[model samples]
Target: SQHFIHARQALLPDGWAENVRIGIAGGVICSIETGVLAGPDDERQSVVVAGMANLHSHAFQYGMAGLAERRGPSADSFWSWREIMYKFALTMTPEQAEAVALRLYVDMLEAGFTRVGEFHYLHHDCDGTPYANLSEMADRIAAAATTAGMGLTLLPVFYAHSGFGGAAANEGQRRFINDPERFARLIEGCRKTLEGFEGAVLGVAPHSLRAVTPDELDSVTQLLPDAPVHIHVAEQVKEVEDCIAWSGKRPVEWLLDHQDVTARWCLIHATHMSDEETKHMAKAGAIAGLCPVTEANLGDGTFNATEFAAAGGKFGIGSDSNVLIGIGDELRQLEYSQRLYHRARNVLAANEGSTGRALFDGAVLGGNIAMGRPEDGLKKGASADFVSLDVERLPHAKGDVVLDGWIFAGRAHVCDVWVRGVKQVEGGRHRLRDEAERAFQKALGELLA
Candidate 1:
């Protein structure tokens, strides 16, 4: 079943609109029209909105979001953060993960993220044993999506080794590792899981160059040829050095030189790349999955967004590590990072648009593509996944500048949210807010205790 609704203003690529109504069917947008068409007895609610897409996530990581914020042994780098993450992953039972994921999706829905790209690598149970159902954890993820009325691009990752050249899997990495045959089974498990949900897609993640050998990467990718591929590129300097030591070339250089990266792929954390590798990746028709807030949190180097955009790169935003998940915060963080890196405001802007709009539009478009959902905007034949903001109430929200007001302003007001024509958040509150929060609390208490 599907329906339509009119909005006072709608944010589309063509710019703002007036007197527009968008139709939604089968949880997908069916049509869009101009001019008010409200019937007599039909209640009209005016909505003002733009689109939001979550390009990458590990829903189970929601449980450990803020718990690992302290300094690590040597330094609190991404690798250090990853070790604590390994311990957290070890504690999660499938049921606990499902509960946490359910609440995480609810929080994301309230934050105006209608779609999520889940980079799920925690496949096996504690001690690296498969559950009775091979896809037990994955099934919980899909169930959480259905429960939250969200679209999903599920990437079951293949993390086979601890270092390059098929090195032995460390005990800390055992839960995430699976052999080539088991990786194939993971893909199949994802396919079967999708039959139970709506607007769900399956993709494969090769983990990283440090985690998979060249031959294993090739063999693993054959499991899902047409689906989007995701991998952690050179996010850290140590990782790059390790990769170079293991192979002759840098991570991005080697991957680009070897793999035929096309439009159907997303490269996460292409943080440390040379100008040449940056330009080559931009020209490769892949999305640079940027997790600005998380990147900032981890002190990862800034992305060469200006150069990458100039090279015609497609970029998307992600709530990586779930450190700080918000509609416009990630976009704003990206712009702010560019300003800090280049010592100039509006650094991501070209001659045609503002910086905020540029990041917002790029994120929505590239995210939809990488997640395998085309119509993510509030347009005809697109999903009704949009967020309405009370710009008047946001910090410095007085100006007639929705994009700037949303991103540049210190605060944001997501007054309402809708996904697939379902009103999940009304008056800036999620319908399941209290229940989900309780579930999150209950799950955390059980895990830590």
Candidate 2:
């Protein structure tokens, strides 16, 4: 059955179109007609725009959002905060993981994220043993996405060593450690689990250069040659230094030199790259996954978006760590970080007249590529994943000004969201918000205790 969505105005791929009517069937946009009159049977919205994809996320980390904010006795850094995350990861049961992820995905949908690229780790039991179903955690992630009605790209992570040069995995890292043989099996299992999900994708992550050796990275990469490949890289100064100590080159430099990094790869947190490394990476066509809010929260330095943009680099946003999951929050923090670094305005406005529009376009482009859906924007044959605004909230705005207001001025003025033609959010609240929240609270109580 075809469903009609009438919008007063819509941000189409070319530009804004008035009186737009989007026809959907089987979760994909079947047709898009502009200057159409709405009938009584049509669902009407004031303003409509495509939803953004979150390129990187750890759904389980939503459970520890505010728990790691306090200062430790020693000097606080990314490394110190990671220890807290390790402790939290080891405690969650499969039920608890599903509960937390359901809450996170609901929140994501409410915040106008129609799709998420989940960088899933935490694959084993507390004692570091494989479950009867090796991909138990990955299955839980897929179930959460299904329940929340959000599109998912599951990137089952490969974590083996604790440091560079194949160091022994520590006790805290036990749950994430998988040998190459097991890791290959885990990837196949994840593929099997996602088979039943709508618009679900399976990708592989090497975790980081510190976690996987060269041979292991090769094996993991070969397991899923066609799937999107993501990895953490150079988020901290210590990590850069440690990479140099291990391989005589910086992390990005070493990876580019050693691996065949192409458009299918996504490098998360290229925060501390040299100008040359930045240019090289940009030319390589891989998306740089920037998680600005979490980067700031963890005290990771700013990304060189200035240089990267100048080199025609592609980049996308992520709510990594999921400390806070807001699409606008991540994009706003990214622009603010660039501003603070360069002491300039509109640092990322590359050819686009509006800063907000430029950032939004970059995110959408890179996000689609990262999620294995490179359809550009809301058009025929694309998923009917979009958000509509309450235009009455900000009167007298037209075109790009609405985006500017949403990104800079207001509190996620998103009135509704639809993922794959089904309404998931209405009036700024997800359909499953209450149920997910109640389950999240109960799971939090158990996890905390």
Candidate 3:
């Protein structure tokens, strides 16, 4: 099948260009021609930009989004939130997982995220026992992504212990626990589940140092040596303190000293690094996966965005817990966090650069690397993954102004979205949004009951 899409203005790899025409064949971009007039057969769009990848997510956590709000008896923190998440996790059936994720991905696409890196960890039945099909939960994740028509990079997690030093997993952690041999099988199961899903990639996650021993981390990475590797790093101060107590080093410091970190690795929430650790991690070419909104919601400390970018660090954004899924929300929060930290406006902007442009470009590049996709844009040979915006909504917008308007204006005007050359969203709503939402409501009702 061949199709043509014409955009009045398109954000190309280098910059925005006028009257761009993109050709798609077999779900991959076949050709891109700029300054071409739209023919009768072409689908026309007002504004277009390459879709961004969400570099870290826990899909199941979407179900528990607003449930953790309202402080408990004790002071609320990330650790306290974890208990709420654990309770919710134990109650979800596979059907509920799929329903929640289907709706979540729809929301993600409408928010302009065409690709997602799902850092999946819930891998078993409520009793902490493997289902008859080992990849049962994983397959539901794949099905949800397929249903939502989004690109998926499924990183099956390898969670073993509850804390650093290989401490035994508590009852709440049992569902996520897996041994090295079992983890290898889970990786294979993910491969099987994602089969025939175009452009779906499988990666390995070591959960975090808190969940895996040094020996286990080495074993799991070797399972899929060529695939991208992702892991939770330092999102909480207590996690950093615990890592130091166990090994006399911060979590990022310990990983940098131990692992052969590379471009294929994405360190989720490398939020609490020293200046030296920041410089070193940047030098290694791994992505710092920052989830700004979730970090803020959990009161996780801020990352040194200015210093990290100055060191040439590659980074990308994610919704993390999916408490709130919005492309602009995450990008805006990332820059605002820096501004709040440094007490200056446009703190992340470079040399009179547009803060929105820098954030979008950096995330696109780092997210492509993190998701194991080729660097993407409105260009030849890239996946035909993009969002069409209504530039008319923002009066007198062009080039960086269009992006700045979208990011800071606190609006989502993504009128259409396409993933792998397939149109999935139209008129700012997913084609299947209502269906997914109905299913999700039912699932949520049952779970709450």
Candidate 4:
């Protein structure tokens, strides 16, 4: 049976249309009709648009989101904050991880993120040993996404080294460390868990230049060729400096020079690229995975959006640390960061265009590429992944201004979200919000204590 969604107005492939009807079945868009009337069995909405993609996430980190905010005697940089993260990572049980992931995915659906590209790294047990089921942790992740009904793009990370030049990992990294051979088996195991799931993708991440060597990066990527490959790159100045020290090239410069970085890759952060690196990366067709909230929280640095955009670069937003999560909030933060950098308004918008629409379009295109999904807005054959704006939060808005109002001013404007033609969030909450929250609070208390 086909489920019909009729909107007073909706953003379609061509543009916004009045009395729009979207027909969905078998987790895909069957047809989209513009300037149409609603049938009796159709679901009615005041406004509708394609759901956003969260191109990067670390679900387990949601447990310690705000816990790292305190004045250390010394300066609290990304380095210091990571130690706190390490503690949580080391102690988090599988049950705790699942609870945290479930809660985060529910939040993601409510925030209009129909799909998530999780850059997952946690893999081993508390003692840093592989469980009998090699992908025990990965199964837990799939379980959470399954329960939440959120689309999943699982990027099993490959982290082995601790610093540049294969400096060997420390105790803190034990849980995440994996040699290429062992990592291949892990990837194999990860596939079993994703079976019988809709719109679930499996990709690989080469954790970072600091973690994987040139040879290891090649081997791990080759393990899953033709799949989405995400990696952390050049998020901090010290990392750039360290890359130069190790290879006489900046981090982005080194990766672009050394590897075949095609559209299949998403360079997470890429924040400190130079003019040449930025233009070259854009031309290489790799998506820039921008985590605006996490970058700001870590005091990492600003991305060169103007230069990248000028070079026809595509980028997507994510809630990296899970410290804060909101589609509008992340887009708003991106624009605001650029504003602070250029000291101008509407820095992300084209000449005489809407900033909200620009950001949304960028996220839609880039996120789909990064997540390896067919869904790219409300189009035929795309996954039936879309969202509706809350009439209460976005009252009296129309057209692109609805996006503007949602991005610039409104919070929790996502009233309903549907993934694979299934409604996961309604009236500003997920159906599982109560259970997820209850488990999340209990797990959080148990783990962080």
**Residue 413 in model 1: lDDT:** 68
lDDT of each: 0.80, 0.89, 0.89, 0.90
RMSD of each: 2.3, 1.4, 1.3, 1.3
Per-candidate TM-score against the hidden true structure = 0.94, 0.97, 0.97, 0.98
Tens digits of per-residue lDDT, candidate 3, 212-246, equal 99999999988888899999998888999999999
For candidate 4, write residues 1-449 as lDDT tens digits: 88999999898766788998999999899998888889999999999989889989999999988888875666644555777798899999889999999999998998899998989999999889998999988999999999999999999999999999999899888899899999999999999889998788999999999999999999999987979999999999999998998999999889998889988999999999999999999999999999999999988899999899999999998899999999888999899999999989999997688999888888888999899874567899999999989767656777788889888877338888999998989988899999999999999889867
Error of 4 at 230 (Å): 0.4
Q: Name the regions of candidate 1 deviating beyond 4 angstroms.
A: 37-47, 72-80, 394-400, 410-412
lDDT comparing candidate 3 with the true structure = 0.89
Tens digits of per-residue lDDT for model 2, 1-449: 99999998899988889999999999899999999899789999888999889889999899999888766777644555776787679889999999999999998898889999999888999998999999999999999999999899889899989899999988888899899999888888888888878888888999999999999999998887888999999998999999999889999999999999988999999999999999999999889999999999988899998789888888888999999988678888999998888888887776748888888878988888988888735989999899998777666677788888888877238889999889999999998899999999999999888
Clashing pairs in 1: 29-382, 31-380
Clashes in each model (backbone N, CA, C under 3 Å)?
2, 0, 0, 0
Candidate 2 wrong stretches, greater than 4 Å? 76-80
